[PDB]
Every structure is written in structure tokens, then in C-alpha cells.
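Submission sheet (multi-component)
Chains listed below:
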Amino acid sequence: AAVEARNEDWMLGPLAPRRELDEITLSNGNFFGSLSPTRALLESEVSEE
Amino acid sequence: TVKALTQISSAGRNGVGAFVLQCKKLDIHYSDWAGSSRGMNGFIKSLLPKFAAANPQIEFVVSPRPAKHPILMGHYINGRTKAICVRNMEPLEILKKAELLRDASGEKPQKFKKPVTSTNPSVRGVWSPYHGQGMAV
Amino acid sequence: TERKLVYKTGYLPTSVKKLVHLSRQIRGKTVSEALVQMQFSKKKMAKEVKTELLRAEAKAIVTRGMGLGKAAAAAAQKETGAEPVKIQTKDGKHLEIRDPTRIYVAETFVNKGFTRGVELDYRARGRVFKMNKPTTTMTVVLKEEKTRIREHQERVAKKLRQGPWVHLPDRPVTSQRQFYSW
Amino acid sequence: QSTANRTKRMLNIPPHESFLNVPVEGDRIIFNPPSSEASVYHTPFKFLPRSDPRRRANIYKLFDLPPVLYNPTKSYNVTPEQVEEIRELRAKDPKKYSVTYLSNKYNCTKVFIMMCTQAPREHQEQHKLARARTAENWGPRRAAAKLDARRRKEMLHRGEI
Amino acid sequence: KQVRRFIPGVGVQDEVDFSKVGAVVRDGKRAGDLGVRTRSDWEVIGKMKSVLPKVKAL
Amino acid sequence: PSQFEVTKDRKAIKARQSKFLSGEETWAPGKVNAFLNSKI
Amino acid sequence: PRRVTPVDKERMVGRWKVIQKELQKRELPVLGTGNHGKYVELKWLGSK
Amino acid sequence: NDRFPPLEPLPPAAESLPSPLPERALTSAKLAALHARLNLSPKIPLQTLARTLVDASADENPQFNNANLAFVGQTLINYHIAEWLLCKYPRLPQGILFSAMKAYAGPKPLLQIARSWGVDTAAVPGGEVDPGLLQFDALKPGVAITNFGYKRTELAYLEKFKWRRGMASRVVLDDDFGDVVRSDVSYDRYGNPDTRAAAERAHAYFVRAVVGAIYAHCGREAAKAFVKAHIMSRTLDIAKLFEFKYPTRELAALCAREDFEPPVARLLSETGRQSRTPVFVVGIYSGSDKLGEGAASSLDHARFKAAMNALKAWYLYSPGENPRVPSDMLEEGAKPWTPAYIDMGEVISR
Amino acid sequence: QPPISQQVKELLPVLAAQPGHYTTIHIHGKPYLVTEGDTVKLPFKMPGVAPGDVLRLNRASVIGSRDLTLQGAPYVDERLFECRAIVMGTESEPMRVMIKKKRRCRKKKHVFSKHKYTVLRINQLKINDVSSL
Amino acid sequence: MSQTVGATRLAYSRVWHHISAVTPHPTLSTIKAPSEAITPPSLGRLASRIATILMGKHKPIWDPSTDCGDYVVVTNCAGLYTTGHKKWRKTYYRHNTRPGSLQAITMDALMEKHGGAEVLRKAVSGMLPKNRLRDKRLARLKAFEGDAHPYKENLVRFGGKVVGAPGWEEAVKAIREADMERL
RNA sequence: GAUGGGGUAGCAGAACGUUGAGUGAAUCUUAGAUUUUUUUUUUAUAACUAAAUAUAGAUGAUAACUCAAGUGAGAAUGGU
Ligand SMILES: [Mg+2]
Ligand SMILES: [Mg+2]
Ligand SMILES: [Mg+2]
Ligand SMILES: [Mg+2]
Ligand SMILES: [Mg+2]
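Outcome: structure written.
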């Protein structure tokens, strides 16, 4: 998404969209510029290696 | 009253009055490591020196290009390029390929349709049914 | 210079052959016209298209800033007394645009989605066939009337650049021969 | 056809019979006037200077007229005093004393009346408006045909038609 | 009229104008032996800052 | 989609929609979509 | 003697000296990748 | 760095200089190829051919640039093309004569000639670029070559209030083509209609400076041969430069001036009258002599086309395809000069 | 040499005086109707010629103007005209593949053909003055 | 290529030719002696000449893809010349794919319903290439039963004299003689 | 100024490509290795030029020569 956002801002210029005001991404349920509790707290169980 | 049109300019006919070779530059890339360039390296030492001395109107640039096959990239006055990969070719095969780029123009290859190409008008004009002896059915 | 929003709806419980006809209906219309046609359509997905079209119009206004010049448009024309712009779409429909910021459905296509479910069709002679319950999505590209004005001015200039019709055209003779035939 | 060689033979057109009667035992120069329109570089003898030696009898010699289409006649029926009458009248009432009325009165062309005097600027603007109002009554099909007629004329005088 | 060319086996053949007839072919291991202008021939030309076309010619 | 319970993100985009349309707020381009060094 | 890179070509045409000032003005790297470091979002989660 | 040593050694002050030094021209393979591509005489060193590629916009010094070299070459090009048109077409109207000159020695053709030679431009001038590249800055239009025209006292009104400008005065006040006289940096931008005119101007000054270089080193005859080989060799249809207004009146005035019988239009042939694409072949006669002929799909158009072709035949009269030029007498050992044909002037009609 | 006929010596100046002239040159027996400035693309690679070589063409069957036409029985005398060309280079066509195949036989034999063509530029076509001969 | 660089306007224009089906034709007739026996062109011999004009094959710029044909106005088609007993023994057939619906008619009976113009259209139609230019080319054939037709102003002229008129060849020669007074 | 030129069953010769291996602890790669695309050129079942997109320093890619085969598919009412 950051690859798509950097290009969009470069081309539109004064028409750059206000993504912070958009709806959540249903693929993960996160807002704009927001992490997930599992990813911000690093509660994922990792291998013993 | 006659008003002059100032949007038409003269066109050049390369060959009439003066000639200009279309090939203006030849990029010769080799590799000291690739085995496909064993012949190219021999062409640069044995035949390129004399070939370049005979074509002073062409700019020859010898530069290494390791990890890549050897190529002959010609640049033409029309602004196009023609690159020929000469991998696994012997020195005399390189020379025959270099003479191809010199004798060639940047124009894209085209099938043979018409021998003659002219821009000047017909000497006898174009046929018209209103300028002959008429035709009775 | 021209604002645009590409909105992909959620997965609707229908097929492509069914939803394609509702997409082609709202194609080229304004958002207001399309919403009125979805409200009074006998199709079941027309209710979903209306909901998704209102959602798209909300993202177009908040995220892209479309349809935010209606007040300034009326003052520019009604007070001035000038004549609005008259254009003609690619299909040939004539329009009279008073607000260049009005949002309209520029592009619309339907896409196939994941399989909703599977239903077993039990037939005679002990034969069973799997029926697939489909899902499909619709994508709408919303733009402002500035785009239809520009695209119209380009088609007009292209037609004016093709030159007029002449009675005696200088058609070329294509065959070359090494002699004179006249 | 199957190949370009065969297509060339099926579309073949023989050369002109003049080139077929080739000579024998030596060279030859024949008179072969083509059935075509000549270029403007074949200057007629009437436009050559008296010094130009190339002036010479026709090549045919070295080996009534068609119908009239436009033969105008100039006339001078107006006198220096009548020209003043045309000026005072045109400025007194350009609506009544139009150019057609003055043309028929003094037996002149409508152009000459416009060379001696012009209507006041106020009467001229309403003329351009009257022609602009009738132009907005044209549809897209008639307005396009009118513009094509105005372009063909310009192209003609540019040598493009 | 034949322009300058390089024959692989013989060497470099200078320009010849058969209309006025002289195909001289020069071979060697140095540039000066081939009969062509070298970087040195261009440096001596640039240092001849005194040669000037005759006023009549100008 | 007609029966999805409108979440808090949907309720926030509908409130702004009324502000931009009414004229309370003047729309401006984004500034946090991407952190470019060019800033253009 | 060495490979002709896009940088050398710009230097021959004169454009390189113009590219340096711009990249430096925008605090972008000239002939390098900078001091930013490699992607770590997947590394921190335990990706292999 | 250690892995990427510089390809062409250059002192640190190289980038500071506006143009590469003269001695650098002796190590450029583009120059040596360009010098041979044009078959220039060895009398022209590489340091001189390098100076012809530096526009005044890249180096403001009177030397190191094209200013003076291009002025001398412009005078030779314009002179040899002018005397050549008046001897091949001595009846050309003045307006058509200005366009014919601008069609041969104008910025448009010279741009095509410079490109016909394989001359590439430098992105931005500097002492680090290859001496074989054309150097100029399209962002600076404050450079202008000296000419022989003067600034009109009414130029301000000529452009604003559409004041009238005659043709007879363009020979004294305007330039050689009839045009009036006097008509940090950031590269984050696109082209402009001004940068194109500045680039097209730079290529033109280069072609002119090459002619001036040949004149300074080789001589006068060498310069004429070069102009006659790359410029006069081009092809131009002057008949396509004519645009008539009321050609029927100009032809009537011509016949009246030369005392010919009044022109009469006659229908030589016709077919398709009362159709969508007829063909009326009209011929204009002055007595019994056929002056011009034109075929159109209307009676009026066919009559106008016939008069236009009659006027072109008068103006496009040519004593010969390769006529003698008064410049040939400067070359000693030439036959006596025969007086050329001098026309009275273009017809002025209502 | 065989003297020119009086009928040709009388009209050749009239032929050379007209504005335009064309000629039908013969290269290896094949005709080519050309004019000064035309480009000829021969359907074969002329051996022993490099770009910049000048050729003198000496086999013309027809040298004519708008109204007059000089005809040579086998060819026109070389003393009456001077036609010269310059080799511009060598062009090529795109590779074309001919697939030779019969019905009910899977073997598809390919033939790859890419021919080279020499290009000329007619830079001189003039008629000489025969008042001396 | 020089022979084709120029103005092809007049080569592609539509010329309006004229021929009478009653005027003797020494070239298309089979009888060539005595002079009083020279007949007009027979139906098929006339149709073969017309099909050449409609195709444009009399033009040196002819190409079958281009529709470079001309018009042909035929008059006096009521006196269409025929040999033997064609007029009363030749039959024209017609079917519409329905068994039993075979329509037959003799030449004399067809000339009674649609005149000799239809007999000539059918003869020319079968002599034209069977492609998408057959209907256009056949439409340019203008056949009329008598001397009256709406194209008496379209017929090609040379000095005001229509081709085929008494003195049209003298008007042509007079124009070419005055055309050689130029370089 | 060499001679020769259709081809089934079938016989024979010469090569390309695919996968893995040796030289290889080798060569090259943010001055862009690799990117299923597009494009350009070269007598070309193949490689090459350039462009666009993304971004790797080796669990990456690779010339040449050689070694070994689970090595080349519009055809089996073939299989998934
Ligand atoms: Mg059961
Ligand atoms: Mg055989
Ligand atoms: Mg065989
Ligand atoms: Mg890729
Ligand atoms: Mg299968």
C-alpha cells in the first residue's frame, strides 16, 4: 500500500487524497496508519530457534 | 495580391551535393571473463584497429561489459540504435557484422515493395481524360 | 487536474450475467440519476448497488474532494447570467452542465468473486451435480463533469482537424512500374 | 493471388503505345505529347521575355476558340459629382438608400457603391448581427457544411484544391 | 570513385578516383603506416596558428 | 452490504461528508499519505 | 578501462552536476542507499 | 571512488568553467568524427570546430563562442541563397522571396541540417561535457546575433494596434527574412515554446558558424562550395508558397500592364454538370494564346484556379535550372558576364 | 565512334531545354525509371561497393522529357547523357518464415529468408551538348 | 515513383460517356463491308464494352480494388440490336428457393415489361466481377429507351462539342494545337 | 566464374533447448544482479538492445567447456 501511496502523491499533487479520513481496510480491519495489537505488541509465538 | 506561406521548408536529399554516413557511433563491448567473448577480444586487437582507421567518420568506443555477452551497438543520425550480439563468433565474423552496421541505416527493416522512391513530380504529369484525344464508346 | 475515485464494492450474492445489466444501466449517468434508477428498479441487487453507490459518493467527497463547488457554481452562472456549457457524450447524448463538479459514473465493470457455497443437485438415475452459488463485485469510477467537458472538447477538435470533404480527392496510385502507361 | 509476383502480373498495365514503337539501327527522338495537365513551370511563350532565346515555334512545327465562360465589360456611368450624391445619401439614411438601391439608381455594381462610401458604424454592426442570428439557427449538420464551404475556398487559394 | 576501405587480408586501401585514371594499399603495425590522420597529426595542425588564407582567396 | 452494521469508521465519514457539503470545512489535500523528501 | 555506468553518461552530457544539487537539496542519496537500514517489519515478527 | 575512477581526467575547476578548454578538443572522439563526417579540409583544426559548438548562452565571452563565427557564416549563406533565387526565379514577388530564403537558410532548415550531421546537444553546458556536443542554455533568451535590420519606431503599435507594415520597407528595416527586429536555476520543469525557439536558434548558429569557420581557414570558394552542397542541394517547391487573394483581378492587371488582350475564361472541357463531383476545365486566353488552365468542381473555382496557374507561370519563370550567378565572376578565369533578366516588380491590383 | 544522326543532333537541345527529364536506366538488364534526386532500392546486394561510392550508369533505353523522348535501339549512346549515382548503404527486410507442409504429415519444415538490398541515390541526370560532335 | 507523384484528381474523376444502341459501330460490329451493312453493336458486344468502362479498365491508373469506373449513358435501348431469334427464343430464369416457383420470361416479353434497358442491365451485370463493387458499377449504367435522358448536360464535352457529336474531333484537335505554345 | 536442392515408411549426420553436476572458496551486482511483460536488433526452434514496475549483496544470477538424464506433447473416447 505504501508503494501505491507514494506514487499517487507524486502524480496528483494538489489533489492528494485524505486517506486518514477513509474507511477501514476490510482485509485486516485496521485504520489508516494504524497497526494491529498483535503486531504492535509482538504477541506472536515464535519458533524455539 | 500574393501572400506568402511561411510553413513550408526545404527537405534534404542525402547524397545529392554531399554525402553523410548514417552510422555516427559504434559501441564495442567485451568481457575479459565470459568465454563467449573470446572472439570479440581478438576482433578488438586484430581487425578493429584497421577497420576504425578506415572509417574516420564513425566514433568507436571500446568499453568492458563483464557478465554480459559481447555486442556491437551502432548509433545512427536518425536517432535509432542497432545492437548485434556477437557471442561465440570469430573475429572475421565480427568484422562482417561491423560492416553491416556501417552500411546500414537506423530505419526499421521493411519488405521489398518498390525499387524507386521519388518526391519530385512526374515529368509527363499524371494521366487525365480531359487532356487527350477523347474516347468514343 | 481531474479528480477520480475507484471504488470496489463488497461481494454481492449474485452472478456476473445478472449484475452486468445493472452496471451497464448506471454507466455514464450522474450519481443522483443512478441512485434514482436503483431505488425504483425491480432487481434485488439494485438495493445493494444503491447502498454501495452512496458509500462511494461519501469517499469521493471526503477523501478526494469531489462535488464541493455547487454553491460557488450557482453564483457564477445565475448571478452573472452567463450560459452554461453544452457538451455531447461519446454515445451522443446531449447535456447542459451547470456545475462542473457534479459527480458521475465514468466507468463501471463487474468482477467474479469467491464461491458463496455449493449446492448438490440430485437428479434421476442416481446422478448428482454440484451447483455453485456465486458472488460478484462491482467497480465504479466516479469523476466530475470537468472530465466530460474536456473529452468533448477533444472529440470536437479531432473532427475539425480531419479537414473538409473535397469533391476531387487526390487518391494515390499504388502500383509502380518501370515505364509510362500514358 | 498467392504470391506478390502473381499479384503484380494480374494488375499489370502495359506501357503507352508511343514507347512500344522502338527504333532500330540507331537512336531516335519522337514527339510524345502526354494526355495530362502541364505544370506551371512550362511557361507559355507569351510570358517569356523578348530576350529569352528559348522562344521557338511549337515542337509540332519543329518536326475557332472554345466557348466563352466569363468575358466581363467594365463601365463608368458615375461622374465625380454623382459620387458625392452617393455619399450624402448613404450617410443620410443607410436603411432606405441601401447599396442595391444606389446601384440600380446610378447603374453601377454593388461593389463600386461600397468603394465610394461606407455606411455608418452603427448600421454596419446590425448587419453583422443579422448574419450571426441566422447562423445560430443552423443545426450541427448545416453548420458543419457551411464551415466546409468556407474552408474549401481558403484551401483553393492556397493551392490545396 | 571508391571511398577508403579496409581489406582484411591486404590492408587499408586509400580513396581512388578511377575517373582520373591508383588503388594504393598501405599496411603496417603503426597508425602512421596506414596512411591516416592520427592524434599527432591533429596536434601539429592545431599548433600551426600562423598559416592564413591569402587575402585574395578571402 | 445493505445489512452490514455501520461501524465507527462509517459513522465518521458520514459526519465529515455533511461538513464539506454544508461548507463548515474546506477540503484540503492529504499530508500524511506518504513521507516523501520532495514534499510536492 | 571499466564499465560505463549511467552516472558516467550523465557526466558526459553535463546533467550529473545538476542531479547532485537536486538530490542534495531534497536530502536524497547520491550514489548510495543512505543510512536508513533494511526492512524489518517481517524480521521483527519472526519471518524466515 | 576507488572502484569508479573518472573516465576522462579533468581538473577540479572543470565544472566551474562555462565551456571545455580548447586543448580538450584534442581528446574527443565525437569532434574527430564530426570533422571527417563533413569532409572538412585539414586546414580547420579541431580546436576551431569545437568553438563552433559553444553558443553564446553557454559562454558569454566574445571568444570561445559562436557569436562572431555565426555572423560571418550567416552573411555568406544569405548572400549565396539570395543571388541564386533572383537568377533562377527573377520574377518572384518580394513576399515569396522572403519565404524562399527563410525556407533554405532559416532556423527550421538549419535545424534539420545540424541534425543531418549527427550533432547531439548537451543537457547543461559546462567544462565537463564532451567538446563534440552542442552547448547552449535554452533558459536564457537574452542572447541575440547582430543583423542589418533596424528597430521600427512604431513596433509597439505594430504588435498592439495592428498597424500596417509595408513590404518595400522590410528590405531596409527588417531582417533578411522580413521579420521585425527586437520582436539558483531549477530544472524541475518541462519544455516551453520559448525553449524550443532557443534550441532551434542554437542549432542554426552552429551551422552558420561552421560556414564562417570554413571561410576563415579555407577561403571564399570553399565556403560557397559548402553552402552549395548542404543548403542549396535541398529541395523546395516554391509553387506551394503562393497564396492568392482575388487572383482574377491580378491576372487582369498583369495583361493590362504588359498590353496583352484582356483575359477571357473559356470552357475547354466539362463533365458531370448537375452531379455531386463535376469537373469543369477552364482556360484563360488573352486573344488566341492560352495563359493558364484549371480544373475544379465549380465554375467559379475552376475560373479562379485557372487564373492562379496563369499567375504562377508568370512568377515562376526560370531562365534555367543551373543558371550563372554573379558570384562566379569573383573566381578568376571565368567567362565574361552576360546581363541577367531584371523584372519590373510584382503586379499591384485592387 | 558511330556519328550521331542528324535528327537527334537537331532535337536534343530541344529535349534538354525543357524543365524536367527522366531516364530508364538498366542495372544488370532490369529497368528503373528514375529522375535526379530519386532513391533506388535494388533487389540484390551489389558486391564490392561501400556507402559513399560513386557509380556511372551507362545503359539507358529511354531519356525523355514531357513532350520529347529519346529512344536507343538497344540503348542510348553514352555520349548523349551523364547519369551518376552514389551508394547510400545496404538495407534489409524482416525475417520471414515459409512453412512447407502437407496434409496429414506433422513435419513442418521452416525456411528463413532475410535478404539485403543495396540503395542508390541518383545525384546527376543531365543531357550533354552535342553541337561539338 | 516519379510517374505517380502529382495530381490524381482528374484520373479518378467520373466521366459521363454516351452511346446509342442504334448508331452503327464499325469497331464493335461483325459486318465491316459494305459501309451500308455496318450494324450497331450487338447486345453482348455492347455490354462487354460497357463493363470495361464501368470497371475503369480503359484507364492507365486502373486497379480492381479502387472504384475508378465511369458512367455510361445508353439511349435508344428499344432498338437494341440482336442476331438470330434471340428476341423471341432466349429465356431469362428466376427462382426464390421455393420448389415450383421458377419464373421464366423471353427477351421480347421482358422488353415489354421493363424495356430494353433491363435486357442490357442483365447483360452488363453478368460481365462484371462478382464482388462488393458490382452493384455500384452497375448503377452507373444509365440506359434509356429513347433519345431523352436527364444527363444531356453531364456528357463529356471538348470545346462545347459532346463526344460522338458531328464535329467533336475538330474541337479537340484545336485545343491541343494551342497547348503546345509553351516550354 | 565448382557441383548439388520435393518427399511418406525408413536410414544417416549435425545442433539447440530443459533439469541437475564439475571448474566455482570462480565472475558480476543500489554506478541496479534479478524482475514470466513490452520493445529493438542479429539468418534467429535462440539470444540481444531499450523501456516500464518492484528492490536484492546471498538459500542471487551467470559466460565458456565438460558430465549425467524422471530432458522437449494440438493429439492415446488419456489423467488431474
Ligand atoms: Mg435413488
Ligand atoms: Mg527441386
Ligand atoms: Mg530433402
Ligand atoms: Mg522485466
Ligand atoms: Mg490429451
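Remark: Residues 31, 33-38, 66-69, 71-74, 80-88, 97, 100, 108-109 of chain B lie near RNA strand K (CB under 10 Å from a C1').
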